Amino acid sequence: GLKPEMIEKLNEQMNLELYSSLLYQQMSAWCSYHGFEGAAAFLRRHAQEEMTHMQRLFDYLTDTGNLPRIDTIPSPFAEYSSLDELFQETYKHEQLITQKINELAHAAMTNQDYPTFNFLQWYVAEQHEEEKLFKSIIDKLSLAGKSGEGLYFIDKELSTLDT
Amino acid sequence: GLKPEMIEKLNEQMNLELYSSLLYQQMSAWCSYHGFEGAAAFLRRHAQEEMTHMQRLFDYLTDTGNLPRIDTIPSPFAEYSSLDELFQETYKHEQLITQKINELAHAAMTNQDYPTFNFLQWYVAEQHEEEKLFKSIIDKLSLAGKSGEGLYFIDKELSTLDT
Amino acid sequence: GLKPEMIEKLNEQMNLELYSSLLYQQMSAWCSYHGFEGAAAFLRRHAQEEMTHMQRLFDYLTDTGNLPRIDTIPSPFAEYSSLDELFQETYKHEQLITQKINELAHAAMTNQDYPTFNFLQWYVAEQHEEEKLFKSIIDKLSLAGKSGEGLYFIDKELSTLDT
Amino acid sequence: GLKPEMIEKLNEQMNLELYSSLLYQQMSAWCSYHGFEGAAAFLRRHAQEEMTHMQRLFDYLTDTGNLPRIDTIPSPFAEYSSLDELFQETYKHEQLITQKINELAHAAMTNQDYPTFNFLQWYVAEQHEEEKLFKSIIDKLSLAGKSGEGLYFIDKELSTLDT
Amino acid sequence: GLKPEMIEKLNEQMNLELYSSLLYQQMSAWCSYHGFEGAAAFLRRHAQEEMTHMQRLFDYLTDTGNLPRIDTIPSPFAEYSSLDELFQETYKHEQLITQKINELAHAAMTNQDYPTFNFLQWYVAEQHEEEKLFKSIIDKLSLAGKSGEGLYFIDKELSTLDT
Amino acid sequence: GLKPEMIEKLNEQMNLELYSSLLYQQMSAWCSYHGFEGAAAFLRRHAQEEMTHMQRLFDYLTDTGNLPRIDTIPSPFAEYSSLDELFQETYKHEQLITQKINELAHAAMTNQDYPTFNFLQWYVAEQHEEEKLFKSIIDKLSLAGKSGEGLYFIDKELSTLDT
């Protein structure tokens, strides 16, 4: 079964995924407020995606006969100076999630927890893909984001980015 | 536009819908832990439903040019003595949500806010339906929930209840 | 190629999967004899499933140019006091198989045998699913198995459980 | 109902069918090890066929309210000097199974057990067909099996023989 | 991100996959020159396969923000005494690739690089399959390759082997 | 048959096509590294195209009973100051390939090698088309490539250019 360190780290990551989903929702509100409807739509879709990462951890914990515990969730509210600054923060947050998944994989390996190591492989692969997506948005903003016209085009791309 | 009281009450209800979704998720974990997989599945579906109520309020606020603000969310964790006690609490919580929606409708009418009164009609109708559903579950538990066999049948019904 | 410890442990697990398939067949005979036709059908299906786990190990060994060796198989015959006692034993046996797979994964990692570690990931995932299934049956028996009526319903569910 | 001699002989044949299935599996491993992949595939298919003969006896015993008992199964491991020697042994084993079925049919007739005599007719017919198949393979090996080229062609035929 | 040892080993393997693709192309030319058109077609298909292994590594490096670097590629030209000698060399080369992939997986594990360990699992599985294929060709040549007639049949099989 | 000068020039062009394919691959890596994903995708597709030109020469040589010889391939690695500079170099390289094809056609005509002159006509026509494509990209960069916004649009066009 799951060792106490692993139960703790899995619950911690479940709650971080929940917080992250709400952070992406709040960021989408910043985008709507500042007239970036396409960026807002993209971040709403990503908020839904990250909530499914929360659910996958929740269900793994219940499968193993452990009771997942949703923690107090701090407010994700923040101020952003620009669309570029916001997406820089989204990318840094995704890098944090990737790091915490790698730390969880390392904990599973050092605890000789092969079921949890196997379970975490989905997160390792998916975080690789999501980091690549957010890096591409950062690159687009670096290239064309220094004018209102460029931001207009990037926003329109974001409205349908990743289907 | 929206008056300050209405902005405050709409944000408050948005955050209550978010809390409620997580409460239903946590209740589903109690059900899984105690072997009621059908009740767990039903509560997971209802958690998803209530999150859409949160999203509808979030989007109304952004439509009106107001910035919705996700608050600190308290932990929904609680202990329950029985499946019946849990569902009694779910029903009481739905009654609370219904009351808060009625208070919001009254606030809209007294503030002469006809767009918000119109927007809230969806919640009035939907809460009526959801209360009816949870009352029916309470009635089933009152009738047949006093044996393990009866709980087995009710759990199986819950696994597919409301599609 | 495969180190001697790994050849030995893989052959051992292949023979344990074979024994397990026959154990589940024998348990199904107990169920038929005591009038639990649905439980019997379920255990016959699971006996077929576990035999495929044997075959997957057999084929891995032959792929690597090693000769798998089917051992002497002890009789799986046993007495059971009740359907609940039988399924408790089935679940404990599945937990044993899960443990032996985890020990094999650990042996592969400590022997720096990355092909075998990769091969074993299928077993880690599948054993997780099968343990969850047998835990759910134990939970149903704990809830409703204390009457002949309840056993009648559980048997009927088992007749088609997991398709 | 079944007389004690008939219960004993039916259980004996059930266990012989089980042993035979594993013997054919082990023979397929010899074929894989020596590079005869088509012969290996054929023997794996025949191992599955013979296991169904075991299951048919198991189910007949349970139908009649008798508890079939899976015995200790001796290891089928053996050495073979050639593909021809292996298939000679497979054919001799099938002839043994045919003889034991004929002895069972005779026992049913002398015990005035008409349900078991009727049940055994399936085995009489099927063993006739399977002996014919293995005799044809022996004949092919006698004709063309004295060269590596001939063995190559026979192996390729075996890979799809009997669909 | 990727540690310097891992960047170096990944680039090294990318270039080894590129060299291998060209080696298989050159071997196919030997086959064409000596009249083995089916062997030539098979090796051309395998050259295309191995180039895709190069591309997968190239793309992983670019995904991680590292610049893959195609090295100077030595000529793969060699002399072969026979079709059997050529395919023995192809099989030994595939075994080398398998070893280098295992060394890369070990480096990822010892460097606590879980994204790269995950990425490499595709190579571990695929190399297992490709080694099995080339071992089967070696076995066919050992059996039937000692006559011109046998080589004729093996060449015809190779023309469509593995679709 | 082929005269020695023609064998030499055909092998030389085969190896130049191979080098060119890898050069286009390496250029695509520069594009990925600098955030031009559409340019990267276009150059990856063109790398695949040019490899087919290599294969067509390889197969012509083998058809004529000559053994094509893959040479040592120098590293294509280079530095580029800008996307425009990179594509200027791609266009100049395509012009070099066109020139070498024209020199080969002239060599075939002066050697009275009508089969090789006929074979080369495919390259004459295809190089005409590919030069036209790369000239059009140069023209787009000259027109709109002097801003980050313009480069953003050109990159997006390149992502699907020439299907």
Added chain:
Amino acid sequence: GLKPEMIEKLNEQMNLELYSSLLYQQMSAWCSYHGFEGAAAFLRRHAQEEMTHMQRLFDYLTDTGNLPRIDTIPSPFAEYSSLDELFQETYKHEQLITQKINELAHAAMTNQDYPTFNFLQWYVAEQHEEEKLFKSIIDKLSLAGKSGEGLYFIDKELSTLDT
């Protein structure tokens, strides 16, 4: 229009194609007589193919307002010591046809006859393909043609070779 040398060479080649078709027919009769029905069928198909080459020249001459003239055709009858000797002669004859086509292409170029040079390109390409086909048959006979069994397999392949 056509110069006298070109009219003469085109008529000469038309008559050589006619003779060749009949030669292939006569060779097919040798094959039938010696029991090689598949080789006979292949040569009958090739006789039909070569007659179409005759017709294409005939029609070119009539298109240009020149009267093609079918010459006296010498008997193609010959003796052959073996199927291999026959196909060696077929291949040498195809090489002769290829040479005469190259001489015709050279004559067209030196006579500045660009319509005839264009017309002949079909023959240059087609003769390349047909030489490759007959070289492959020679290679099969060299490999497997030294036994009656091998000749049996080659004959069976020829029966459907090139559709």
